[PDB]
Design an enzyme around this catalytic site. Structure first.
Site, PDB file in Angstrom:
ATOM      1  N   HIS A 135     -37.697  14.906  40.810  1.00  0.00           N
ATOM      2  CA  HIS A 135     -36.228  14.304  40.746  1.00  0.00           C
ATOM      3  C   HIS A 135     -35.335  15.532  39.979  1.00  0.00           C
ATOM      4  O   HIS A 135     -35.591  16.423  39.091  1.00  0.00           O
ATOM      5  CB  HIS A 135     -36.408  13.377  39.812  1.00  0.00           C
ATOM      6  CG  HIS A 135     -35.165  12.482  39.494  1.00  0.00           C
ATOM      7  ND1 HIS A 135     -33.973  12.808  39.066  1.00  0.00           N
ATOM      8  CD2 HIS A 135     -34.761  11.095  39.951  1.00  0.00           C
ATOM      9  CE1 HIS A 135     -32.990  12.310  38.931  1.00  0.00           C
ATOM     10  NE2 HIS A 135     -33.406  11.072  39.684  1.00  0.00           N
ATOM     11  N   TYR A 184     -40.955  11.706  40.057  1.00  0.00           N
ATOM     12  CA  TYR A 184     -40.439  12.101  39.063  1.00  0.00           C
ATOM     13  C   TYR A 184     -40.427  13.624  38.751  1.00  0.00           C
ATOM     14  O   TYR A 184     -39.569  14.153  38.330  1.00  0.00           O
ATOM     15  CB  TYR A 184     -41.187  11.588  37.720  1.00  0.00           C
ATOM     16  CG  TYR A 184     -41.443  12.401  36.439  1.00  0.00           C
ATOM     17  CD1 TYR A 184     -40.554  12.505  35.353  1.00  0.00           C
ATOM     18  CD2 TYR A 184     -42.577  13.492  36.346  1.00  0.00           C
ATOM     19  CE1 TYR A 184     -40.638  12.965  34.248  1.00  0.00           C
ATOM     20  CE2 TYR A 184     -42.610  14.035  35.040  1.00  0.00           C
ATOM     21  CZ  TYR A 184     -41.761  13.911  34.091  1.00  0.00           C
ATOM     22  OH  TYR A 184     -41.918  14.857  32.875  1.00  0.00           O
ATOM     23  N   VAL A 225     -35.534   8.867  30.844  1.00  0.00           N
ATOM     24  CA  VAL A 225     -35.998   7.493  31.482  1.00  0.00           C
ATOM     25  C   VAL A 225     -34.885   6.794  31.962  1.00  0.00           C
ATOM     26  O   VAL A 225     -35.198   6.069  33.047  1.00  0.00           O
ATOM     27  CB  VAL A 225     -36.557   6.654  30.085  1.00  0.00           C
ATOM     28  CG1 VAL A 225     -36.837   5.115  30.798  1.00  0.00           C
ATOM     29  CG2 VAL A 225     -37.947   7.141  29.610  1.00  0.00           C
ATOM     30  N   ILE A 266     -34.050   8.526  35.743  1.00  0.00           N
ATOM     31  CA  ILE A 266     -35.233   8.802  36.458  1.00  0.00           C
ATOM     32  C   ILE A 266     -36.046   7.346  36.907  1.00  0.00           C
ATOM     33  O   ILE A 266     -36.532   7.209  35.923  1.00  0.00           O
ATOM     34  CB  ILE A 266     -36.060   9.923  36.253  1.00  0.00           C
ATOM     35  CG1 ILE A 266     -35.341  11.219  35.896  1.00  0.00           C
ATOM     36  CG2 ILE A 266     -37.247   9.980  37.124  1.00  0.00           C
ATOM     37  CD1 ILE A 266     -36.337  12.361  35.635  1.00  0.00           C
ATOM     38  N   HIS A 307     -48.889   9.651  31.876  1.00  0.00           N
ATOM     39  CA  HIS A 307     -48.820  10.990  32.191  1.00  0.00           C
ATOM     40  C   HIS A 307     -48.618  11.505  30.766  1.00  0.00           C
ATOM     41  O   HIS A 307     -47.739  11.533  30.201  1.00  0.00           O
ATOM     42  CB  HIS A 307     -47.366  11.235  33.262  1.00  0.00           C
ATOM     43  CG  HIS A 307     -46.929  12.849  33.272  1.00  0.00           C
ATOM     44  ND1 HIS A 307     -47.719  13.480  34.184  1.00  0.00           N
ATOM     45  CD2 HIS A 307     -45.858  13.341  32.605  1.00  0.00           C
ATOM     46  CE1 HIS A 307     -47.175  14.796  34.141  1.00  0.00           C
ATOM     47  NE2 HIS A 307     -46.044  14.578  33.330  1.00  0.00           N
ATOM     48  N   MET A 359     -39.795   6.980  35.672  1.00  0.00           N
ATOM     49  CA  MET A 359     -39.930   6.840  34.673  1.00  0.00           C
ATOM     50  C   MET A 359     -39.708   5.671  33.856  1.00  0.00           C
ATOM     51  O   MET A 359     -38.680   5.149  33.786  1.00  0.00           O
ATOM     52  CB  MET A 359     -39.308   8.013  33.682  1.00  0.00           C
ATOM     53  CG  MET A 359     -39.490   9.449  34.206  1.00  0.00           C
ATOM     54  SD  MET A 359     -38.244  10.346  32.977  1.00  0.00           S
ATOM     55  CE  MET A 359     -39.464  10.722  31.517  1.00  0.00           C
TER      56      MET A 359
END
Lengths: 100, 100
Positions: free
Chosen positions: A74, A71, A30, A33, A4, A36
């Site tokens: 989230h 993500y 990171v 989530i 991404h 990630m």
């Protein structure tokens, strides 16, 4: 794995310290989530297309195209957007599977 | 490490086979340009950037910012442009050191 990729320009009024805090906060997502898997960022050093004005790169690693959506919605990512939305002037987003 | 990021859009008349061979050839430059340490490419699937239309990403890894120039003026890189520049409509270039 899927990448991404975010290519962005900050608004003029945002300071260097603010940008640093922005990226620090994003990198630290990171941990909270699950989708990630990794984050790196950097500032363009070459300025080959000044006219387009993009200055920074963020790359996020995901297990699949499907987990990107986990993500996106989230609450930690939504919260990040809610806090820092005013920082950026424009951005490009790309999602792709790196290959060679 | 420094990453050299190429963001591309192909001309409409370029075929899918031509795009594949374009990237196959570009990836193989690693074998003949010493400065190139790694290469990946990919096609965006999300198409979230309405007005800009870029579709593909190439990322080349370099040992340092200085060795990018060894690639820039390498005759194999110049030659690639001479053979294939008609394939792309526009491109953006960024060079950055990935960090946390």
């Amino acid at each position: 794995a899927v990448k991404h990729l975010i290519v962005l320009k900050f608004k003029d009024e945002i300071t260097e310290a603010q940008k640093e805090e922005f990226f620090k906060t994003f990198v630290n997502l990171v941990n909270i989530i699950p989708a990630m898997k990794d984050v790196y960022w950097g500032k363009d050093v070459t300025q080959k297309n000044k006219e387009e004005g993009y200055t920074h790169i963020v790359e996020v690693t995901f297990e699949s195209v499907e987990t990107i959506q986990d993500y996106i919605i989230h609450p930690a990512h939504v919260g990040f957007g809610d806090v820092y939305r005013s920082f950026w002037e424009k951005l490009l987003i790309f999602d792709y599977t790196p290959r060679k």
